[PDB]
């Protein structure tokens, strides 16, 4: 993806967010950070992964933007300069959205292979059995040397 498409895509995904709420320079800053770490030009397979992380970081910057200003710590207002009176009572709204977004990554890109390896059962596949068995660093139960080593007990996991 080029530098101009990312701002176009992020703004649409964030419900048409405006420039003052989030500048185009900040989006490039997070976009560039994941470009150098994932060398997207070298391997184009990380386009969905780099795109998903970029949006999440932008939401994080939005939350901290409410902080460091007076918006986060106020929950009341009252103006009265005569006959005009106004009283109203997004920091908390951005919170659960970030939690919700991390649970539905398909909203960004459906090809993220999300939710595929929840349950793992060991010893029910030949591919997984031999990979563990043939690992030279593996130490299993058949290596119990006891008091002092004896040649009756194997020193390697793999079968001869």
């Amino acid at each position: 993806m080029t530098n101009e498409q990312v701002i176009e895509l992020v703004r649409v995904l964030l419900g048409g967010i405006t420039t003052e709420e989030i500048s185009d320079q900040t989006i490039i800053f997070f976009w560039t950070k994941w470009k150098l770490t994932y060398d997207l030009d070298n391997r184009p397979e990380k386009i969905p992964a780099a795109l998903y992380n970029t949006v999440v970081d932008c939401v994080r910057w939005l939350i901290v933007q409410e902080v460091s200003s007076g918006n986060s710590s106020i929950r009341e207002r009252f103006e009265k300069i005569g006959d005009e009176t106004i009283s109203v009572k997004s920091w908390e709204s951005w919170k659960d959205f970030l939690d919700w977004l991390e649970l539905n990554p398909d909203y960004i890109d459906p090809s993220l292979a999300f939710n595929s390896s929840l349950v793992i059962i060991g010893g029910v596949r030949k591919d997984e059995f031999f990979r563990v068995k043939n690992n030279p660093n593996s130490y299993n139960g058949f290596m119990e040397q006891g008091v002092y080593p004896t040649p009756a007990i194997p020193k390697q996991s793999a079968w001869p």
């Binding site: 207002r77 009252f78 103006e79 009265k80 300069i81 005569g82 006959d83 005009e84 009176t85 109203v88």
Partner: protein, 142 residues
């Protein structure tokens, strides 16, 4: 000391208005009078932020068009809250009262002359209240 009122509001909209200072001068060379042919000198400026509101009652002297033996004359007034300092006239001097331009009931724009200014010297915050009366139509006041 006051803190909240020492800063600009963030709920009620405020607007800026234009103003102009006023002096006077004598022109006649031989007339023995201080008046002479009086002239007024102007120097424009603006108010930082202001709020305009109309008179609250319906008293006969506060109505807009008034019936006189000559014809349906014109009258307008306002109450203004502002953070700029405006001055009235001072005696034994050549300074006149400041004026500021605001919309009227006839759809046009006319000059209003400051008549009453309220200040709170012991509080510190620069917030003022003014009371204004529209200049007579066809003249520049006095």
């Amino acid at each position: 000391a006051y803190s909240l009122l020492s800063s600009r509001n963030r709920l009620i909209p405020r607007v800026e208005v234009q103003c102009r200072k006023r002096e006077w001068v004598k022109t006649d060379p031989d007339s023995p009078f201080l008046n002479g042919g009086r002239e007024v000198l102007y120097t424009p400026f603006t108010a930082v932020e202001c709020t305009v509101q109309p008179m609250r009652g319906k008293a006969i002297r506060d109505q807009n068009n008034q019936l006189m033996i000559g014809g349906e004359e014109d009258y307008d007034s306002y109450t203004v809250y502002s953070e700029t300092l405006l001055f009235r006239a001072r005696e034994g001097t050549e300074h006149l009262s400041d004026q500021m331009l605001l919309p009227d009931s006839g759809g046009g724009q006319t000059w209003f002359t400051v008549m009453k200014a309220d200040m709170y010297p012991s509080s510190g915050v620069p917030r003022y209240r003014y009371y204004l009366i529209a200049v007579p139509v066809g003249t520049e006041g006095g």
